[PDB]
Symmetry: C2
Subunit: 192 residues, 2 copies
């Protein structure tokens, strides 16, 4: 897994392309009327027993990288998605690997309204891929509990696909949710 630019990745010869998106919306809710949720971020349990972002292989010679993702998004999340924009302005980063397939993964971040995320969760059960590729949607706990492990650190101890965990960390710093030192603290507490 190595960092590559969009402009360069698209001119690669033969390698397979993939697109995935973090969908998120602000929230005033408090766990135990005490711990702020801050933000709702969506991930999923996949058919393969691993956690990941919605999306997938972007049929490279079809339409745009955006159109490919949009399709996967509706395929995997459901009908509510047809009215989700997801432009080029929602592109974030790309990576190349030769690990298992020789592949390029493109990460996307889009902010929605909480109402929108709620409806997406609500209609997720109607996605072509519900119970198939998508075993259920989940929210990322952003907080850390009093035992300093429960919440996000404990969350990061689950099994992630490709480099979705890497991508998640990126988003967290990217959206100003946690500084680097906090990100390191939650990893160290998660390591042991």
């Amino acid at each position: 897994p190595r960092n590559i630019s969009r402009e360069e990745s698209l001119q690669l010869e033969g390698y397979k392309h993939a697109c995935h998106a973090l969908l998120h919306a602000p929230s005033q809710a408090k766990l135990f009327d005490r711990v702020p949720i801050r933000r709702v971020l969506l991930m999923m349990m996949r058919f393969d027993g691993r956690l990941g972002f919605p999306g997938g292989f972007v049929d490279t010679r079809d339409i745009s990288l955006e159109e490919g993702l949009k399709r996967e998004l509706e395929e995997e999340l459901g009908p509510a998605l047809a009215t989700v924009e997801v432009t080029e302005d929602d592109y974030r980063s790309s990576q190349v690997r030769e690990h298992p397939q020789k592949c390029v993964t493109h990460f996307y971040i889009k902010e929605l309204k909480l109402e929108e995320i709620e409806r997406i969760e609500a209609e997720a059960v109607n996605a072509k891929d519900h119970g198939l590729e998508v075993m259920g949607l989940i929210r990322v706990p952003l907080y850390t509990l009093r035992d300093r492990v429960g919440g996000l650190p404990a969350f990061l101890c689950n099994n992630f696909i490709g480099n979705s965990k890497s991508q998640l960390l990126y988003a967290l710093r990217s959206l100003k949710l946690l500084r680097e030192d906090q990100i390191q603290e939650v990893l160290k507490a998660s390591h042991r």
Copy 2:
């Protein structure tokens, strides 16, 4: 933790009790049209970032174990559980611990019709505890993919609460889903 009978654990004083349940239904669906799903098993992502079964603490001095689970299941899974009765016949096993704290955990298993699991999934977003104490429902992949890892083996590499992983393995053997050899197989490919 340690094995204890139901009747024996209910005679204990100064212990905490909790009940958790695996709701499941048969399915004819085939992943990629080739790989049988076989059965649908519900678990959840919890507030603490771990996988677990729905359920919770029950005060034995106020309500029975069944009433407690019943209320906790409505709270955690939502309104569709009003049509579902998990009774004494669904009770399976109990484990007891003293350290860290005096706690007894009861495990229930109940079969439903596929439309019931589907409706529970649909209405879980209305649960009192959704997006707070319950972060979302998930199905347990029962199959192993061609790489011999994807599916159940990889799922078992996730972060589970208390002995919830062990409750799941018990259910797999109990429901005649996997042989003792297959469970050991699935477990090896994990670690």
